[PDB]
């Protein structure tokens, strides 16, 4: 284990009792450095390892199919875990409540967290520190490189963060150890998942018919499904990913993320198995490019920028640009409302919308566009900021995530982007034209699948 992946969050006064890893963000037994390292404290301290999520209040923000995609997947894993020897703890509440009672009650020796750069994880290691007195480590087991390694700052571009990453990965691409059982043995989420989804309901995405918006048989959740997910993209669609990847009529994504997200595969484990595969090159350079690069560039933006989710945070050639064209009349201005029923009068939008609306998942090409476009029909890019953050964490599988505020922000604010040719309204944020779409994609084949 390379100690390079693990960070103090808090010193403290180690107790006897067993380590406690606060699983939040890698929800997942196989391929875990931070249940890895938390194994390892486990066993030269000669305690237990046990594992405690906590199912916070935070919920109710989101819909019905995050919440099941996240608890079918956390049923999945008290099994493994418990094949482990490794029992689980489901904490009804928010962590620095529930995590303090947690270590209290069971006279925990250490805490181990993994690593997300999100502002509400960030609240809760606060509240979790006030509450505690013994020690408290994240682990990055997200990344192939920890985050705070891969680069000391925020990188405006991809190719001044892309060298500093690969010049990392010779030494933290490597194999996962097998997770070692406990020596020995130390509400069901059913009940838990029905509690909340009667609380979901009347916000439930329906239909005028009221027949549900939501088609949740395109990622079936959990870790198993997670690996056959990955070893089909790698059999049947890496060959074609180069050449196919910017076409959203076709099939041809990994549709990994919604497991990325929550952790119920390792993109660690997806690169190892993608490097030893031989498949078309060119495909593997632009597969790797999106799972290393853009992935953990990601994490490096939400990390150094505390304002990542904020007009602030973007280059100041952007914000000069986009104040210089605050006062440009936009051509047609949506409601949060208008937008959310794909109800403009761009019917790839409305289209692309609808595939969000139905699947939880929109293509990665027609998120660029989609994203574009709020910024282009609303009052001001803070405007434009906060309908692309709603509507992408109420309704993606993957959002709520480090890669939709650096995906929002480079498509509204030109984070990781360079200025383009100026126009009014957008200013020198790139552009992406219906027209141009029309040219590159079959645009109303796209739009009959999703109307
Ligand atoms: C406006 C906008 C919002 C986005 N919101 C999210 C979000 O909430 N959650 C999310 O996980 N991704 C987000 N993305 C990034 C990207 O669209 C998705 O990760 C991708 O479409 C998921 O499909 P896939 O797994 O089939 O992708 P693939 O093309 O197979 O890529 C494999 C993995 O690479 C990573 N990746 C791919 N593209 C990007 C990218 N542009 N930025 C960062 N990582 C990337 C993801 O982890 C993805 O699972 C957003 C992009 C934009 C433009």
Redesign the pocket.
Known sequence: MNPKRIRALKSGKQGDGPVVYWMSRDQRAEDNWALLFSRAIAKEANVPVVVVFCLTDEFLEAGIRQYEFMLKGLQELEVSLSRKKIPSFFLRGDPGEKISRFVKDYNAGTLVTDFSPLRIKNQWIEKVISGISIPFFEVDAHNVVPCWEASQKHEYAAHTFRPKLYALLPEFLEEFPELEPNSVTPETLSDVLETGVKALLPERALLKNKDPLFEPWHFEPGEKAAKKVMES?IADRLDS?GAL?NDPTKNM??????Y??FGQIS?QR?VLEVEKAESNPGSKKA?LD??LI??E??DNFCYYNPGYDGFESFPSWAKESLNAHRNDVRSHIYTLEEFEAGKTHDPLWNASQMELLSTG????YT??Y??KKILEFSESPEKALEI?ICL??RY?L????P??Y???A??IGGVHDRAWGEREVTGKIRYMSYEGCKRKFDVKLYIEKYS
């Not at 994504?253 to 919604?258: D, I, R």
């Not at 993957?398 to 995530?401: H, L």
């Open positions: 993209f990913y990847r994504l990994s549709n990994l993320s919604p990325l997200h993109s997806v597969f999106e799972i853009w992935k560039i990601s998942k929109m293509h990665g998120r660029m989609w994203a692309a992408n964490d993606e993957d959002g709520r995530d890669n939709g650096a995906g929002i480079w498509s």
